[PDB]
Structure 1
């Protein structure tokens, strides 16, 4: 999983504060960081199906949070996907 330090950085960049761990932007940024990190794992470990199920849950959760944010605030949504480099 993501380190305490790497997590704390992401909360600082995308959150309102260090305490603001709940915001959709932070949550999406955290999921994105771990999805990107795990690409190296699954490149090496192609038949780690059990861990991949956890990755696909991260992907699905991110998709649901982005869809929530899109319909709640299109502008924040647009900013976020630019910063994180997501298609949608």
Structure 2
């Protein structure tokens, strides 16, 4: 999993209040970081299917979040995707 400190850092940056944590953008960021982390793992361990399932799920969740953001508020979404470097 993502280390506590790292998570906190992520929250602080993206979250407006820094105590917020549940902001859509923040959540997305958290997901994204985790995904990035797991890439390294999965390069090594290609047959770790069970673990990869979780990763896939996370990705899906992130996508959903992004979609939600888009309909609600476009500018914010755009900003987020610039920050994280998500192609979509």
TM-score by length of 1: 0.98
- The runs of 5 or more residues in structure 1 that have no matched partner are none
Q: Cα offset for 1:16? A: 1.1
| Alpha-carbon distance in structure 2 between the residues aligned to 1:8 and 1:17 | 12
**1:12 corresponding residue in structure 2:** 12
* Contact kept? 1:35, 1:59, Cα under 8 Å: yes
- The runs of 5 or more residues in structure 2 that have no matched partner are none
Of 15-24 and 56-65, deviating more is: 15-24
Q: Cα offset for 1:19? A: 1.3
Q: CA RMSD in A?
A: 0.5
Q: Cα offset for 1:18? A: 2.3
| Alpha-carbon distance in structure 2 between the residues aligned to 1:40 and 1:70 | 29
**2:55 corresponding residue in structure 1:** 55
Q: Cα offset for 1:17? A: 1.9
Q: Cα offset for 1:65? A: 0.2
CA offsets, 1:47-68, max 9 Å, x none? 0000000000000000000000
> How many pairs align?
88
| Alpha-carbon distance in structure 2 between the residues aligned to 1:17 and 1:9 | 13
Give runs of ≥4 in structure 1 deviating > 4 Å.
none
